[PDB]
Design an enzyme around this catalytic site. Structure first.
Site, PDB file in Angstrom:
ATOM      1  N   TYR A  69       0.831  -1.580  -0.181  1.00  5.65           N
ATOM      2  CA  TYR A  69      -0.125   0.089   0.042  1.00  5.65           C
ATOM      3  C   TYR A  69       0.721   0.991   0.359  1.00  5.65           C
ATOM      4  O   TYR A  69       1.872   1.085   0.605  1.00  5.65           O
ATOM      5  CB  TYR A  69      -0.669   0.197   1.112  1.00  5.65           C
ATOM      6  CG  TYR A  69      -0.269   0.123   2.754  1.00  5.65           C
ATOM      7  CD1 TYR A  69       0.639  -0.662   3.125  1.00  5.65           C
ATOM      8  CD2 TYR A  69       0.013   1.419   2.713  1.00  5.65           C
ATOM      9  CE1 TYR A  69       0.830  -0.424   4.607  1.00  5.65           C
ATOM     10  CE2 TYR A  69       0.558   2.220   4.606  1.00  5.65           C
ATOM     11  CZ  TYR A  69       1.012   0.727   4.867  1.00  5.65           C
ATOM     12  OH  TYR A  69       1.615   1.587   6.042  1.00  5.65           O
TER      13      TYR A  69
ATOM     14  N   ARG B 242       8.056   3.937  -4.884  1.00  7.45           N
ATOM     15  CA  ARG B 242       8.365   2.753  -3.680  1.00  7.45           C
ATOM     16  C   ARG B 242       6.279   1.939  -3.629  1.00  7.45           C
ATOM     17  O   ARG B 242       7.194   0.697  -3.696  1.00  7.45           O
ATOM     18  CB  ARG B 242       7.819   3.693  -2.808  1.00  7.45           C
ATOM     19  CG  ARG B 242       7.905   2.950  -1.371  1.00  7.45           C
ATOM     20  CD  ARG B 242       8.192   3.597  -0.638  1.00  7.45           C
ATOM     21  NE  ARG B 242       6.939   4.667   0.574  1.00  7.45           N
ATOM     22  CZ  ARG B 242       6.810   5.081   1.298  1.00  7.45           C
ATOM     23  NH1 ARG B 242       7.634   5.516   2.071  1.00  7.45           N
ATOM     24  NH2 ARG B 242       5.541   5.498   1.863  1.00  7.45           N
TER      25      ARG B 242
ATOM     26  N   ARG C 126      -7.959 -20.523  -2.107  1.00  3.78           N
ATOM     27  CA  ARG C 126      -7.013 -20.426  -0.687  1.00  3.78           C
ATOM     28  C   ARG C 126      -5.626 -21.672  -0.415  1.00  3.78           C
ATOM     29  O   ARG C 126      -6.217 -22.354  -0.459  1.00  3.78           O
ATOM     30  CB  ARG C 126      -7.849 -20.672   0.886  1.00  3.78           C
ATOM     31  CG  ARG C 126      -6.466 -20.373   1.920  1.00  3.78           C
ATOM     32  CD  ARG C 126      -6.990 -20.514   3.170  1.00  3.78           C
ATOM     33  NE  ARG C 126      -6.533 -19.879   4.416  1.00  3.78           N
ATOM     34  CZ  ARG C 126      -6.065 -21.027   4.568  1.00  3.78           C
ATOM     35  NH1 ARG C 126      -5.710 -21.835   4.892  1.00  3.78           N
ATOM     36  NH2 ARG C 126      -5.266 -19.588   6.124  1.00  3.78           N
TER      37      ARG C 126
ATOM     38  N   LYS D 129       6.792  -2.287   2.408  1.00  5.59           N
ATOM     39  CA  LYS D 129       5.414  -2.039   2.929  1.00  5.59           C
ATOM     40  C   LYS D 129       4.007  -2.737   2.788  1.00  5.59           C
ATOM     41  O   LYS D 129       3.602  -2.390   2.197  1.00  5.59           O
ATOM     42  CB  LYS D 129       5.201  -0.692   2.668  1.00  5.59           C
ATOM     43  CG  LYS D 129       5.554   0.528   3.213  1.00  5.59           C
ATOM     44  CD  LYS D 129       5.190   2.078   2.519  1.00  5.59           C
ATOM     45  CE  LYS D 129       4.468   2.442   3.274  1.00  5.59           C
ATOM     46  NZ  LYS D 129       4.212   2.531   4.315  1.00  5.59           N
TER      47      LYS D 129
ATOM     48  N   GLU E 231      11.345   2.210  14.220  1.00  2.81           N
ATOM     49  CA  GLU E 231      10.341   3.892  14.062  1.00  2.81           C
ATOM     50  C   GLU E 231       9.413   3.648  14.734  1.00  2.81           C
ATOM     51  O   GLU E 231       8.854   3.081  15.251  1.00  2.81           O
ATOM     52  CB  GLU E 231       9.925   3.641  11.866  1.00  2.81           C
ATOM     53  CG  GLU E 231       9.472   1.747  12.516  1.00  2.81           C
ATOM     54  CD  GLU E 231       9.071   1.344  10.831  1.00  2.81           C
ATOM     55  OE1 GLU E 231       9.081   2.529  10.180  1.00  2.81           O
ATOM     56  OE2 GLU E 231       8.984   0.114  10.695  1.00  2.81           O
TER      57      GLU E 231
END
Ligand SMILES: Cc1ncc(COP(=O)(O)O)c(CN)c1O
Ligand SMILES: Cc1ncc(COP(=O)(O)O)c(CN)c1O
EC number: 2.6.1.21
Lengths: 282, 280
Positions: A31, A50, A98, A145, A177
């Site tokens: 994301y 990114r 799945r 991310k 962070e």
């Protein structure tokens, strides 16, 4: 409003997510969040770069080019008539029965994007915020991310319950962070922050702030610091697309110096301000 | 087929996941997989207990009691006419405007459950499988069965790419569990497996196997073993609701003992078999 769904801007009601979307079952996706100021996107290209880098790290192939993604975000901002706020967008591996292993390469990734009107955090930028230390129990690829944000969820909730704004995470007593931001410390006019390795996300705002420090001739040292050292800093602040440069003035009931925003944080904020998109006469 | 959507059984086609379901944006939820044998759910109460424990660990309050949830699972199996396969079900914190911290306690959890016909892996239970070692880079709360499964996804794919069936994970050479299973090693008739702490999922199949061991008077030691110690084991196997007791005969080209399913593994498989439903 309208939502980006794959390569189409459609009304929110038309969007349908399947129960076996890998983002729903394994958090298998990446994301990005982009801030929009008075209609213009801030550092959109860095975020798109990114998004592609994160997707690439977990071997997801975004079906279209950066230029097409950019055009779509533009269209999305226009259709929703977004003044000041942010665009949230994510990409997941796709829908498939799945199974842990990657599906056959014929499965198309699902892209979702939408906007939200949200003002700049005025009070926070001016008064600073309180933070708390939380042990970093996340996985070892924090540089990606992805949608596996459960550790961040638990951390932010912990900060919120104690009346704090952000949780400053620490691995082996070393500050990495925040749950949704990067952490910066200032000591004797020198800027410190954890280097950009697998322990943290290399935030765009983090890079903008370092660029700002170089511009005001402020020395930057990308060396990690412990919890004990952080509390001894002259200044401390967190950075994120939505938080910009938010001063931290207290950690767990201990004031960073006098509990006031420092001179270098203020300078860095003034320099950051010259980069925000604005007209020329309005 | 039919899907369990909250407390209703609806046709698959009608189920819609909201883009802001926290399970979708943060992996904020927990899940279970229950094996069904000839229409009967195996160790369902155990999986249900564990679902509620997992939810409680990340503070999700499931709106139904265990009795209602049990009743709903039965209806799902019945409506789909499931003979042999498994039920997959999960619970997410709910739908709310994107924010990391918990929503207002008024937000309801979203429950999804569906079935899938899937035969026992008889070929693998007899022949055994190949595995590979993959460094465990997952978070420190592996005891929670959450939807944050990207680490297991990457491990499974690495194994899958080397032609192996399972990736056996290790933290600084200490074996933990597999990408979707628990690992057991046998040396001199003694059963070894990593203890149930924050480093692994406390598998239900794992606990059934340990119970089987106690039943056939086989000593069980819950002590971690290294990747190197595993390669020196007499026998090795992984367990999962779907793998049952799967023998591992080779890991990275190095065969375990002779590359044949050991004797104790066979004794465990037989004791395990006495527990699975086999009605006519
Ligand atoms: C873990 C983490 N670290 C840092 C950031 C901030 O990076 P950015 O400056 O690009 O918003 C984020 C996103 N808000 C994040 O989720
Ligand atoms: C990490 C992990 N460990 C073990 C297992 C298997 O245990 P169970 O018998 O309860 O399926 C799983 C299955 N989902 C798993 O994901």
């Amino acid at each position: 409003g309208y939502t980006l769904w794959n390569d189409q801007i459609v009304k929110d009601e038309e969007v349908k997510i399947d129960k076996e979307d890998r983002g729903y079952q394994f958090g298998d996706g990446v994301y990005e969040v982009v801030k929009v100021y008075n209609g213009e996107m801030f550092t959109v290209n860095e975020h798109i770069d990114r998004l592609y880098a994160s997707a690439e790290k977990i071997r997801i192939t975004i079906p279209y080019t950066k230029d097409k993604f950019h055009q779509l975000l533009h269209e999305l901002v226009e259709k929703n008539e977004l003044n000041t706020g942010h665009i949230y967008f994510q990409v997941t591996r796709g829908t498939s029965p799945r199974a842990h292993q990657f599906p056959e390469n014929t499965v198309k990734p699902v892209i979702i994007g939408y906007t939200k009107e949200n003002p700049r955090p005025l009070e926070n930028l001016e008064k600073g915020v309180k933070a708390t230390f939380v042990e970093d129990i996340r996985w070892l690829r924090c540089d990606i991310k992805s949608l596996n944000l459960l550790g961040a969820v638990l951390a932010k909730q912990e900060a919120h319950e104690k009346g704090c704004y952000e949780a400053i995470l620490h691995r082996n007593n070393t500050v990495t962070e925040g749950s949704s931001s990067n952490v910066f410390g200032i000591k004797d006019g020198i800027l410190y922050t954890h280097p950009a390795n697998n322990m943290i996300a290399k935030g765009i705002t983090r890079d903008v702030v370092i660029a700002c420090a170089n511009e005001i001739n402020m020395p930057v040292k990308e060396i990690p610091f412990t919890t004990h050292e952080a509390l001894k800093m002259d200044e401390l602040f967190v950075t994120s697309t939505t938080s910009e440069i938010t001063p931290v003035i207290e950690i767990d009931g201990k004031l960073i110096r006098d509990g006031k925003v420092g001179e270098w944080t203020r300078k860095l904020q003034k320099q950051f301000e010259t980069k925000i998109p604005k007209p020329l006469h309005i």
